[model samples]
Target: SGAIYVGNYRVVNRHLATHNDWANLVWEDSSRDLLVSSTTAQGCDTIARCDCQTGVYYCSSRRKHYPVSFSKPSLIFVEASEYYPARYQSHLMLAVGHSEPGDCGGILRCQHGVVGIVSTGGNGLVGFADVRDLLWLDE
Candidate 1:
């Protein structure tokens, strides 16, 4: 008997309004590191930093925006490094058409075949592409 925590949070970024709000979260596995990009749907996009050991969330910007939703919504992590506290390093790549009605459904697939589907009424967390696909960018 456990309940699911699912809902959209409204947020502002860089003085703009984003439909969905997402913070910065990082997940690292050896050479592979995953984090949400600064993609604001309605407001200016900002980043969130989390504590890997404590699971605490922080923001690099002045105020808190919305949190990013993962394609899976379960595979997120936080940690610190030599320079930043792991919280400042996370970022989300800005994209268009985010936070719009009926604009939530999408898929995030990594080069390693890691895929996550973003459901409707969800945060538009940006996903990274497989490195192998970069060569095809010119085509």
Candidate 2:
């Protein structure tokens, strides 16, 4: 059980099936807020992390923290994917939820702190990555 620091989290390094994207986390651009996750984010170039209360999204490529209004959308978890399997078959939380494609990586937060991020999506039940099972990453 190797619980070591890998980038942000203290991973356990189970040494199972390491995903390519997990390794890709080592590289990122400065002009970004909420980093996209999943198989891969759709709009990685123009996406920004929005504030929970402000609802404002920032595009660092433009260098602006534009003001915005805010509100929480619905995310209800129904049995998740059992019919057609999702792309991320490993550690995922499936549900019948969706908000915005741009909302990728946006977090579940309050006036104080954060709870989680919006990761997986699609016609298949929406889901979340472990951010936990990732105790191990490839070398």
Candidate 3:
């Protein structure tokens, strides 16, 4: 589950393409008193690609190799080039790569750690995401 809970805080956000694709969010436990958030560079998405068939989501820029799997749920990572439901204005272009219908928010992560938040996908979803660059994420 993308959901995480601490002693007094919980991460709050969404993945609807028409919604706020923030990097992170936190709110109070006192009857849902919302608090800090990450919609800036600090919350910037690391460029990445996904293996549509195999369900592998990997990163483009990082200190070390970072790979994310789609099956896990709740993920979001930026991809290179033009794509629908993407925010080109941002530094990283997080394309809604090969997504399942109604599967808007899933945290594509691995046992290693979290990779990214699922922004948006499935307009009626392909290409590096379709298995073109299967090993690209290996980078």
Candidate 3 achieves a global lDDT of 0.29
Q: Which 10 successive residues of model 2 have the least lDDT summed?
A: 28-37
The order by descending TM-score is 3, 2, 1
Identify the superior model by TM-score, candidate 1 or candidate 2: 2
lDDT against the true structure, per candidate, is 0.24, 0.31, 0.29
* Top-lDDT candidate index: 2
TM-score of every prediction relative to native: 0.19, 0.29, 0.30
Candidate 1: regions farther than 4 A off: 1-72, 75-97, 120-139
The local distance difference test score of model 2 is 0.31
Worst 10 residues of 1 by lDDT: 1-10
True-structure RMSD for candidate 3: 13.8
lDDT (10s digit) by residue, model 3, range 1-139 = 1332222222332322223323344322211111223333333122224323233343222212223223322123433323233232221113434544233224444333333433334352211211112122222
Of the candidates numbered 2 and 3, which has the greater lDDT value? 2
| lDDT, candidate 2, 52-131, per-residue tens | 44333222223433333332333333233432222223433333544333334433333322323344456632333223
At residue 123, candidate 1 shows an lDDT of 49
Which tens-of-lDDT digit does each residue in 92-130 have in candidate 1?
Answer: 322222343222223233323212222212143333211
